[PDB]
Amino acid sequence: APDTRP
């Protein structure tokens, strides 16, 4: 939901 790009 927020920025979950690693």
Partner: single-chain antibody
């Protein structure tokens, strides 16, 4: 090393306007959402705004306190993020930081701006000693913290130096020491230091996500004695 560098702060009159800038290097800026967060002695850390990607039509969200007064924007060709602040109020006084990645790994040094409901609760203070295991907790007034709150943990050292430790509940940021870990325990988010070290004496903040905004806890002062 990633670098974020804010600029544009100053000493302004209420009703005034100011634009802050932040330039990023060392990571693929255009693939990450960017945030502004401010620190005041009165209100601790407060999330201000986010801006998402080109593929999201640069969607933005704002704290209720700044909505209609502030505008976040970015320029991917310059690896920069901006905060335009209009109709400044005394309560806007603070140190402003640009931050992002997984979700608050990286923080700039901050730029000072002097103008002249969900509650997230943390332990005010904890005392430990080197080699002990210490667990800090983060509670929401809404009920249970779950993986849908994407808990983050950030450390503040002197002088207003922030580094993200954990994002997405339990994911360590790159280069963060192995002794730090994140968990959910009894419906709270929790940061554990397994074998505390003297250099871990710091203030630790948690942040929780609620659909389209973040709410930071009040911070815990951790003292490491001996």
């Amino acid at each position: 090393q990633v670098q974020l560098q804010e600029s544009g702060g100053g000493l302004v009159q209420p009703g005034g306007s100011m634009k802050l800038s932040c330039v990023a290097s060392g990571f693929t800026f255009s693939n990450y959402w960017m945030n502004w967060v401010r620190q005041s002695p009165e209100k601790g850390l407060e999330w201000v705004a986010e801006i998402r990607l080109k593929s999201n039509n640069y969607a933005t969200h704002y704290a209720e306190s700044v909505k209609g007064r502030f505008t976040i924007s970015r320029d991917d060709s310059k690896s920069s993020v901006y905060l335009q602040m209009n109709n400044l109020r005394a309560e806007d006084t603070g140190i402003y930081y640009c931050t992002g990645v997984g979700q608050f790994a990286y923080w700039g040094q901050g730029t000072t701006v002097t103008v002249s409901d969900i509650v997230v609760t943390q332990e005010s203070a904890l005392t430990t000693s080197p080699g002990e295991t210490v667990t800090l907790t983060c509670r929401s007034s809404t009920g249970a913290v779950t993986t849908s709150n994407y808990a983050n943990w950030v450390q503040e050292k002197p002088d207003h130096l922030f580094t993200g430790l954990i994002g997405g509940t339990n994911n360590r940021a790159p280069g963060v020491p192995a002794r730090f870990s994140g968990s959910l325990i009894g419906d709270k988010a929790a940061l554990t230091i397994t074998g505390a070290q003297t250099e871990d004496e710091a203030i630790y903040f948690c942040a929780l996500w609620y659909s389209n905004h973040w709410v930071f806890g009040g911070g815990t002062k951790l003292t490491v004695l001996g």
